[PDB]
Design a binder for this molecule. Sequence first.
Ligand SMILES: Nc1nc2c(ncn2[C@@H]2O[C@H](COP(=O)(O)OP(=O)(O)O)[C@@H](O)[C@H]2O)c(=O)[nH]1
Ligand SMILES: [Mg+2]
Length: 156
Amino acid sequence: RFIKCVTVGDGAVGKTCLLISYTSNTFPFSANVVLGLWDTAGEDYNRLRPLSYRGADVFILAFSLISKASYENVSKKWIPELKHYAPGVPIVLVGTKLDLRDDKQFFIDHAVPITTVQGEELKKLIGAPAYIECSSKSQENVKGVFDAAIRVVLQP
Ligand SMILES: Nc1nc2c(ncn2[C@@H]2O[C@H](COP(=O)(O)OP(=O)(O)O)[C@@H](O)[C@H]2O)c(=O)[nH]1
Ligand SMILES: [Mg+2]
């Protein structure tokens, strides 16, 4: 009846904002439904970050929908890391910053978008049971992230 969830992913992808959005319903860590949420720092921390993983029931592996590099780093860095420290714990893959992907003006001002179908193909590649695209800014699908997280750990 407890669920430790650890959020991981590159710098600036939106991990802390994701937790603030879910828990506080605002945009600048625990919940009860009928869930402990851990934040991490995503290279200086290579040795210390993994310490947070012990007894994790699920990982939220975030990458940014506006950043091809964070997309590439899921397979390059994060998967190898989680498999070393916590093989077998399920992964919910989250593409953050959905509000920016929607906005043509963002790419004029700035960035390479990741499509829903490409996020889905990455999901399959890493064996994640879930892939959710979300925006902490608009809050869209943020509740969905954590609802996936609980569904994927709880029996059935
Ligand atoms: N537009 C937009 N900006 C975001 C979103 N999530 C985070 N940010 C911005 O991205 C930056 C990094 O967010 P932060 O949560 O601190 O990322 P973290 O390093 O992964 O923890 C901040 O400038 C945020 O305001 C989002 O959904 N939409
Ligand atoms: Mg943070």
